[PDB]
Amino acid sequence: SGFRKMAFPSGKVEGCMVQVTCGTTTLNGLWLDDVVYCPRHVICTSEDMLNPNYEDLLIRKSNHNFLVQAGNVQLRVIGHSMQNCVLKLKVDTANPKTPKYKFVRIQPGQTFSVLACYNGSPSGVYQCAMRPNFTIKGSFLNGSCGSVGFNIDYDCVSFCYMHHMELPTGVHAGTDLEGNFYGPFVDRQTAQAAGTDTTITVNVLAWLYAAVINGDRWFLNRFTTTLNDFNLVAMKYNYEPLTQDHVDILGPLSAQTGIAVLDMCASLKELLQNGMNGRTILGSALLEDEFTPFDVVRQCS
Amino acid sequence: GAMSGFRKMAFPSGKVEGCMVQVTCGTTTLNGLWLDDVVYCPRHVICTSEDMLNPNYEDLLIRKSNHNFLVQAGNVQLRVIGHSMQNCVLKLKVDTANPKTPKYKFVRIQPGQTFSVLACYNGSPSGVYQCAMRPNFTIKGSFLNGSCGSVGFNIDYDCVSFCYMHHMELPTGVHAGTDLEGNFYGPFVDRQTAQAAGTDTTITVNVLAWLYAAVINGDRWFLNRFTTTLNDFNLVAMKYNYEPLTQDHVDILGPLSAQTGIAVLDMCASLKELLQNGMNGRTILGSALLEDEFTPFDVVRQCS
Ligand SMILES: CC(C)NC(=O)Nc1ccccc1
């Protein structure tokens, strides 16, 4: 018993963090093989960062512009290129601490760990989910530009996120490791705000399934709803609509607890309309939405 | 501001990952901590299921030889050249010093203080989380199976301060353990006899540090114009199962009080009203819950 949210052990990622400096700007880079990955906005001054031509500003930088430092050892840039919003700096030295790794792109509602870094130094690690509005909750004290998000599967690190900027609303925004932004954001000093966030409905249901596996059962009722009717009530409460895909992902938990997905959806619809009336689920008075169905399957199976 | 939307973080775990090993005695398998040429693990690794109600560890240990213990780091078998007991922690000397040994200390923590736990299974790091030593001397840990010997730690200036090792799960869902010198936190014993955690309380000094942090970051809806006496506050607080506040904790919040202009007992009056009215969907620093697992030490350093 006991459901604590956990981040992946960060050691494999710690051995890849470096410090990247262009002019006055300093931020974190990801050193894998003989390439350092970092946000492309490190080559911008105050003049440039309003509507910059990144590819034109980038060719006109040499290789020695870039100050790459890994501990006390300065890595030697022997080439640079751009891939969407990530700058790629090929260096002369392969990282001997390079782990088994992959670049993957995740979907809103999926969870990963972030290794918060400052000036290339790892400061802390936390578990989070990609919000439905494609932002990640976190403060200025939860990593600066170039900190990465990742999952670990087997012994392989799946890099899925790189932090590019902190929005004023206590959330940050970024890209995958191929430079494609998550959400309608641009790497520019312009008026940018996150849309209205919603609650990740499939994750709440995963969490309610976890509560049932830990014998927290008071909220279960004999009723079922339709996917159509559940969605009607869900959106009124700023919950995400549930898709038939989400229903299928929840399949294994339904088979392991005996609670059909639309059976559990009736309990969650009741929770939304009446609250918990002074009760708790898994020890919390609030519904958790940063546990994927697979997070529960790992921890509770 | 700086801490708008702050999430709690564990320390980067890599330095501890390098010290985790698997310790087996007979058919019992759990985690050990490999520092220099010593492996530390719970002493009940030497117990059978029948020993667990009333193990005589001194008796069980003297019947063990160095070759009773199987220590494994990855695919490498470490060879035990000695064993001794320090309180509830078993200490296995091995013939190989851990080349990944970080700079480290053994420290005992008080309730309310925070640290990270590297949850491990079969010597293998599985996950990491940040927590506080609860006032009832337990920690709320992961689902678990065989995470005994997982350690809790702080990192400061690349030196790892080891403060906790997991020993047992109480019937409540919470966990109990020792410092790295083998002394339990709280009144628990490493036996399978009927043990129950006391009624847990909210760490009030940590809540007040959190509310102060919210004020530095411009989140001010919960402040009132009232103040209170320390003993009027403690009368109300304990009725909400909040931990009593001492002059020590008043002093500890002193820097935050000076940085915001809000006297500690002023904030206490604000907290008293929060407990009265409740946060009912309203958020502080982006969190819909009164956080009690962030210490005044961390707030002052993150809000210079
Ligand atoms: C509750 C919100 C902030 N999320 C987290 O706390 N993730 C996290 C995971 C492991 C250790 C510390 C934190």
Active-site entry in A16, A41, A44, A128: A41
Rounded (5°) CA angle A126-B118-B252: 70
Query: Tokens 């002023």 correspond to what residue?
Result: B266
Interface test with A, best of B124, B143, B153, B291 (most A CBs within 10 A): B143
Query: Tokens 């038939």 correspond to what residue?
Result: A244
CA dist., res. A5 & res. A15, Å (int): 24
Q: Can you tell me whether residue A60 is helix, strand or coil?
A: coil
Query: Positive or negative CA dihedral for B252, B253, B256, B260?
Result: negative
CA dist., res. A287 & res. A203, Å (int): 10
Cα B199 to Cα B108, B135, B238: the distances in Å are 22, 9, 12
Domain covering B204-302 assigned CATH 1.10.1840.10 in the classification? yes
Residue B50 CB neighbours (<10 A): 8
At A77, the amino acid letter reads: V
Query: Tokens 């993957």 correspond to what residue?
Result: A104
CA dist., res. B22 & res. B18, Å (int): 12
Q: Can you tell me whether residue A176 is helix, strand or coil?
A: coil
Q: Which two tokens stand for residue A151?
A: 């999952």
Q: Which residues contact B69 (CB under 8 A, 6 or more apart)?
A: B23, B24, B25, B80, B83, B92
Q: Which residues contact B258 (CB under 8 A, 6 or more apart)?
A: none
Q: Which among A15, A168, A286 is the nearest to B289, CB-wise?
A: A286
CA dist., res. A160 & res. A180, Å (int): 11
Residue A260 CB neighbours (<10 A): 15
Phi, psi of B106 (to 5 degrees): -105, 125
SS3 assignment for chain B: CCCCCCCCCECCCHHHHCCEEEEEECCEEEEEEEECCEEEEEHHHHCCCCCCCCCCHHHHHHCCCHHHEEEEECCEEECEEEEEEECCEEEEEECCCCCCCCEEEECCCCCCCEEEEEEEECCEEEEEEEEECCCCCCECCCCCCCCCCCEEEEEECCEEEEEEEEEEECCCCCEEEECCCCCECCCCCCCCCCCCCCCCCECHHHHHHHHHHHHHCCCCCCCCCCCCCHHHHHHHHHHHCECCCCHHHHHHCHHHHHHHCCCHHHHHHHHHHHHHHCCCCCCECCECCCCCCCCHHHHHHHCC
Q: Nearest to residue B266, comparing CAs of B239, B292, B233? A: B233
Strand partners, B284: B287
Active site residue A41: yes
Q: Nearest to residue B300, comparing CAs of B247, B248, B253? A: B253
Strand partners, B118: B128
- For residue A87, how far is its CA from the centre of ligand 1 (angstroms)? 29
CATH of A11-91, one of 3.40.50.880, 2.40.10.10, 3.20.20.80, 3.20.20.100: 2.40.10.10
Q: Which two tokens stand for residue B94?
A: 């091995």
At B230, the amino acid letter reads: L
CA dist., res. B249 & res. B269, Å (int): 15
CA dist., res. B33 & res. B92, Å (int): 10
Decide: B53 in ligand 1 pocket, CB within 6 A.
no
How was this structure determined? It was done by: X-ray
CA dist., res. B188 & res. B183, Å (int): 10
Q: Which two tokens stand for residue A39?
A: 């946000």
Ligand 1 pocket: which of B3, B4, B6, B9 to mutate (most atoms <8 Å of CB)? Answer: B9
Q: Which two tokens stand for residue B167?
A: 């020993």
Q: Which two tokens stand for residue A40?
A: 């492309």
The CATH number of A201-300 is: 1.10.1840.10
Decide: A61 in ligand 1 pocket, CB within 6 A.
no
Name the helix (H) or strand (E) containing A193.
none
CA dist., res. A110 & res. A161, Å (int): 12
Contact A221/A265 with Cβ under 8 angstroms? no
How large is the angle between the packed helices B204-216 and B264-277, nearest 10 degrees? 100
Q: Which two tokens stand for residue A20?
A: 């990247």
Contact B168/B176 with Cβ under 8 angstroms? yes
Q: Which residues contact B120 (CB under 8 A, 6 or more apart)?
A: B20, B31, B126, B147, B149, B150
CA dist., res. A243 & res. A271, Å (int): 20
DSSP A43: G
Q: How many residues does chain A have?
A: 301
**CB burial string B270-304: b at 16+ within 10 A, e below:** bbbbbbeeebeeeebbbbeebbbbbbbebbbebbe
Phi, psi of B257 (to 5 degrees): -60, -40
CA dist., res. A259 & res. A209, Å (int): 8
Q: Which two tokens stand for residue B11?
A: 């320390």
DSSP A199: B
* Cα-only R_g, chain B: 22
Ligand 1 atom with the smallest distance to the CA of A290 is 4
Q: Which among A6, A123, A286 is the nearest to B128, CB-wise?
A: A6
Name the helix (H) or strand (E) containing A161.
strand A156-167
Contact B173/A2 with Cβ under 8 angstroms? yes
CA dist., res. A198 & res. B245, Å (int): 38
Contact A151/A58 with Cβ under 8 angstroms? no
